[PDB]
Design a protein around this motif. Structure first.
Motif, PDB file in Angstrom:
ATOM      1  N   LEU B 115       0.803  -1.213   0.000  1.00 25.96           N
ATOM      2  CA  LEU B 115       0.000   0.000   0.000  1.00 25.96           C
ATOM      3  C   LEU B 115       0.838   1.265   0.000  1.00 25.96           C
ATOM      4  O   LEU B 115       0.283   2.358  -0.146  1.00 25.96           O
ATOM      5  N   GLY B 116       2.143   1.152   0.166  1.00 29.13           N
ATOM      6  CA  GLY B 116       3.008   2.316   0.219  1.00 29.13           C
ATOM      7  C   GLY B 116       3.612   2.467   1.604  1.00 29.13           C
ATOM      8  O   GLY B 116       4.204   1.528   2.130  1.00 29.13           O
ATOM      9  N   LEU B 117       3.479   3.660   2.180  1.00 36.57           N
ATOM     10  CA  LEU B 117       3.840   3.890   3.574  1.00 36.57           C
ATOM     11  C   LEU B 117       5.317   3.593   3.809  1.00 36.57           C
ATOM     12  O   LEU B 117       6.080   4.477   4.210  1.00 36.57           O
ATOM     13  N   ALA B 118       5.718   2.349   3.574  1.00 34.34           N
ATOM     14  CA  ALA B 118       7.110   1.932   3.622  1.00 34.34           C
ATOM     15  C   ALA B 118       7.604   1.611   2.219  1.00 34.34           C
ATOM     16  O   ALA B 118       6.856   1.082   1.393  1.00 34.34           O
ATOM     17  N   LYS B 119       8.866   1.937   1.954  1.00 31.15           N
ATOM     18  CA  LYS B 119       9.473   1.685   0.656  1.00 31.15           C
ATOM     19  C   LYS B 119      10.080   0.295   0.544  1.00 31.15           C
ATOM     20  O   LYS B 119      10.570  -0.066  -0.530  1.00 31.15           O
ATOM     21  N   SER B 120      10.064  -0.485   1.617  1.00 37.48           N
ATOM     22  CA  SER B 120      10.606  -1.833   1.606  1.00 37.48           C
ATOM     23  C   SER B 120       9.819  -2.671   2.596  1.00 37.48           C
ATOM     24  O   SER B 120       9.207  -2.140   3.524  1.00 37.48           O
ATOM     25  N   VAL B 121       9.834  -3.989   2.396  1.00 39.57           N
ATOM     26  CA  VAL B 121       9.160  -4.858   3.348  1.00 39.57           C
ATOM     27  C   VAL B 121       9.891  -4.868   4.685  1.00 39.57           C
ATOM     28  O   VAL B 121       9.255  -4.975   5.737  1.00 39.57           O
ATOM     29  N   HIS B 122      11.215  -4.715   4.677  1.00 37.53           N
ATOM     30  CA  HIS B 122      11.962  -4.586   5.921  1.00 37.53           C
ATOM     31  C   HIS B 122      11.672  -3.262   6.608  1.00 37.53           C
ATOM     32  O   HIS B 122      11.557  -3.202   7.838  1.00 37.53           O
ATOM     33  N   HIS B 123      11.547  -2.192   5.823  1.00 39.89           N
ATOM     34  CA  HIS B 123      11.138  -0.912   6.381  1.00 39.89           C
ATOM     35  C   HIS B 123       9.755  -1.015   7.001  1.00 39.89           C
ATOM     36  O   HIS B 123       9.508  -0.470   8.079  1.00 39.89           O
ATOM     37  N   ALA B 124       8.845  -1.730   6.343  1.00 38.20           N
ATOM     38  CA  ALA B 124       7.504  -1.926   6.883  1.00 38.20           C
ATOM     39  C   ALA B 124       7.542  -2.714   8.184  1.00 38.20           C
ATOM     40  O   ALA B 124       6.842  -2.380   9.148  1.00 38.20           O
ATOM     41  N   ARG B 125       8.338  -3.780   8.220  1.00 37.81           N
ATOM     42  CA  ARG B 125       8.467  -4.569   9.438  1.00 37.81           C
ATOM     43  C   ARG B 125       8.951  -3.701  10.587  1.00 37.81           C
ATOM     44  O   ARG B 125       8.327  -3.650  11.657  1.00 37.81           O
ATOM     45  N   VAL B 126      10.048  -2.974  10.368  1.00 37.03           N
ATOM     46  CA  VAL B 126      10.593  -2.149  11.437  1.00 37.03           C
ATOM     47  C   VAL B 126       9.630  -1.028  11.794  1.00 37.03           C
ATOM     48  O   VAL B 126       9.569  -0.611  12.948  1.00 37.03           O
ATOM     49  N   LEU B 127       8.830  -0.551  10.841  1.00 39.14           N
ATOM     50  CA  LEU B 127       7.916   0.547  11.127  1.00 39.14           C
ATOM     51  C   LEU B 127       6.760   0.082  12.001  1.00 39.14           C
ATOM     52  O   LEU B 127       6.398   0.748  12.981  1.00 39.14           O
ATOM     53  N   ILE B 128       6.187  -1.076  11.673  1.00 36.33           N
ATOM     54  CA  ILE B 128       5.164  -1.665  12.526  1.00 36.33           C
ATOM     55  C   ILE B 128       5.736  -1.947  13.907  1.00 36.33           C
ATOM     56  O   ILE B 128       5.041  -1.802  14.917  1.00 36.33           O
ATOM     57  N   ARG B 129       7.007  -2.340  13.977  1.00 38.73           N
ATOM     58  CA  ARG B 129       7.655  -2.490  15.275  1.00 38.73           C
ATOM     59  C   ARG B 129       7.769  -1.164  16.018  1.00 38.73           C
ATOM     60  O   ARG B 129       7.589  -1.124  17.238  1.00 38.73           O
ATOM     61  N   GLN B 130       8.086  -0.076  15.320  1.00 33.92           N
ATOM     62  CA  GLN B 130       8.128   1.240  15.945  1.00 33.92           C
ATOM     63  C   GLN B 130       6.754   1.878  16.072  1.00 33.92           C
ATOM     64  O   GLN B 130       6.668   3.077  16.353  1.00 33.92           O
ATOM     65  N   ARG B 131       5.705   1.099  15.846  1.00 32.98           N
ATOM     66  CA  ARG B 131       4.309   1.471  16.103  1.00 32.98           C
ATOM     67  C   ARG B 131       3.960   2.819  15.476  1.00 32.98           C
ATOM     68  O   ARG B 131       3.634   3.798  16.146  1.00 32.98           O
TER      69      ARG B 131
END
Lengths: 48, 185, 43, 37
Positions: B115-131
């Motif tokens: 959906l966007g938001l993060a430019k990478s799946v690893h960025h998305a993982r860490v972002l969901i971790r950083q809530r």
RNA sequence: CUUUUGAUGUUAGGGUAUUGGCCUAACAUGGCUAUGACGGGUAACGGGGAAUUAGAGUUCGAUUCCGGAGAGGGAGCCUGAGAAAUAGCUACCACAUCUAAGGAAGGCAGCAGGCGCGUAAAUUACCCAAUUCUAAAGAAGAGAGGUAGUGACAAGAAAUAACAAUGCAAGGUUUGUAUUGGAAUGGUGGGAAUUUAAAACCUUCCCAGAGUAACAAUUGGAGGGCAAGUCUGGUGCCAGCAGCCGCGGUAAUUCCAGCUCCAAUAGCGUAUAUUAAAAUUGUUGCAGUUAAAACGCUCGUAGUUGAAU
RNA sequence: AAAAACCGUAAAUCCUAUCUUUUAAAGGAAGGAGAAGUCGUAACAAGGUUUCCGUAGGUGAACCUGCGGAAGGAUCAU
RNA sequence: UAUGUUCGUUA
RNA sequence: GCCCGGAUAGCUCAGUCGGUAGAGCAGGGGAUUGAAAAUCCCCGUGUCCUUGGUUCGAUUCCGAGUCCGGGCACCA
């Protein structure tokens, strides 16, 4: 758990040639004498 | 005496621990979905095995049997809620066809990266971790949150995230520059 | 009576340190570099 | 042991004589036990 | 095998809360058993259930619930609706406490805790706030029970980064790749809300708080099985490794180290047991000429099986 | 109420017997394991006496001999 | 169809 | 308790009617071997048990003790 009685070098089989380091252990649970191999290079010296 | 609440294992070790053709496939999948461990893919395929086992048991029961024409639509509507099956899939024969990638595409991190938001799946993982991520009035810091068809429309940044309308930038960074500025002025 | 040479090679092996190196990468980030390396450069 | 006694495929003592020797030894042991008991 | 010493039954009675050899008197000789009686073993409380299961199976179940039994071992008994009760009594056996020596008092397989034993198991904590029981029944009690402490027994989620610009590589100005350098965020500490019987944890909010993010992931391996080194030193049939096959006498891919790599990962080894693997216990579903294995042969009871209508 | 007796319930101790489990022992006699003992040459080739079975006797040892079998034989056969 | 034994251990 | 015998290497055993002290095994170095057995070369190690005497000098000839072992025995 046992009490070490003595340390003995045991001959290896014929195809090999070594002196495996073992200890004669008297078990404190029943009193039987067993022979336990001592794994490691200098581990025989680590056990009095 | 003992507690009465249950607990179960959600993963099964694969047996045959050194299949090269399995290790390569599973590493491909791990890297391309950016997940932390192969225990995670083991959980996912344990789940998929559970669904497949239920479906396979149902197919043996003849049609218009009460058990089948109860649990079949129970399972089918659950599957469409998870989104694994679309409108083009309608029968019990297609739940057997589900695969690990189509199960993994419903994870929160893959959905947010898509959906966007993060430019990478690893960025998305860490972002969901950083809530910084919200699934609609409710923020989630579980990367393996499986998204339903009624949640992707309301995945967006959390209201308390600095990117979601909270405290804008680094406090020390925004303070040091202003202190130097007042000292110069 | 030939146990006096127990652990001889442990004693006479030269001792060398573990040097400095760099902190190893672990976790998901560890799997990142093992995953990504095997298609791009090779070919 | 079973019906595959003898079967000298391995070059061992002849089974007939091994049996004879065991029988002699059993006779001696039986006589000794009779003497003691 | 049982049967004098009740074994099986009849008759009469006694006893019981009631039926009953439960016990007594007389009488008869019955009762069980190769469809395993009577014995022996069990490192055997039974079940609900647990592990492993394609299906059959195999193994486990001291332990949340139910039923049983016991309160150091036996036996006896009072009260009572209910006990052969044991934080009730009586005695013996074994331990063991005080004693002024005359005599007294004991029973943690309740909760903690101690010794011993052993491979093997936590606090001499807080509370009746919940659940529920007893009471002269709101108001008192309850080591029942709950709360916390210890707790890598198991179980679940899940950090140890992510991102942008140049060098370098691949390629038609696309990916990987070290320098920088700013964002994000927990772990941590402090305060608060709240939680709670009180407290703690969780959750939430405010302060500081990450660049070698030193806030530094380990365990076990790299000959084959079996993923990963014909790299460098040392030792030189020694020391050692090695589940098995094997390695080691100067080029050791196998020992002792360094580097690298592989595997699983806050987890990873080891021992023993057990399941699958094992169609190597075979009902499904093994094998028996020669690999283990057709009784020397026939009769034959039990058992198993049995034409058509 | 002490106390006593008698039937009964019956702990406990002792003697005897049997069984179960563990264990000592002069001596005897097996088996297994030793890197390299002595003696012979039994078997595998017709293994130099074809091998083997049952049985009996004998011998330093493997083994030898008698009687009756087998081919797993060295013969699928005037 | 007279006799004619033996070959240490490991790799 | 008297009658005898030996004490010799690290272990086991021989010594012109006194003069030198020796073999085997244990034992290092070797020679052989791919290695190791076996074989063969050479090292080493002793008041010749302990004391005393005889002697020019003693392991030897005496005398005694010590240990251990071979033969003793009194009558009716």
């Amino acid at each position: 758990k046992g009490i070490v009685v003595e340390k003995v070098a045991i001959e290896a089989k014929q195809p090999n040639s070594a002196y495996r380091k073992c200890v004669r252990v008297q078990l404190i649970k029943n009193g039987k004498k067993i022979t336990a191999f001592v794994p490691g290079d200098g581990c025989l010296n680590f056990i009095d | 005496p003992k507690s009465y609440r249950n607990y179960s294992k959600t993963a099964r070790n694969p047996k045959r621990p050194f299949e090269k053709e399995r290790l390569d496939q599973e590493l491909k999948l791990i890297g391309e979905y950016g997940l932390k461990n192969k225990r995670e893919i083991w959980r996912v395929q344990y789940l998929l095995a559970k669904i497949r086992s239920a479906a396979r048991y149902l197919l043996t029961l003849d049609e218009k049997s009460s058990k089948r024409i109860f649990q079949g639509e129970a399972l089918l509507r659950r599957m469409v809620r998870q989104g694994l099956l679309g409108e083009n899939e309608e029968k019990l024969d297609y739940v057997l066809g589900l695969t690990l990638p189509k199960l993994l595409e419903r994870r929160l991190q893959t959905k947010v990266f898509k959906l966007g938001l993060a430019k990478s799946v690893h960025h998305a993982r860490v972002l969901i971790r950083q809530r910084h991520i919200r699934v609609g009035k409710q923020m989630v810091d579980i990367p393996s949150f499986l998204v339903r068809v009624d949640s992707e429309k309301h995945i967006d940044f959390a209201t308390t995230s600095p990117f979601g309308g909270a405290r804008p930038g680094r406090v020390k960074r925004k303070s040091l520059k202003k202190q130097k500025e007042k000292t110069e002025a | 009576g030939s146990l006096a040479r127990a652990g001889k090679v442990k004693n006479q092996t030269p001792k060398v340190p573990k040097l400095d190196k760099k902190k190893r990468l672990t976790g998901r980030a560890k799997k990142r570099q093992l995953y990504n390396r095997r298609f791009s450069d090779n070919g | 042991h079973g019906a595959s006694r003898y079967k000298k495929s391995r070059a061992k003592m002849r089974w007939k004589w091994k049996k004879k020797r065991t029988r002699r030894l059993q006779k001696k042991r039986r006589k000794m036990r009779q003497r003691s008991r």
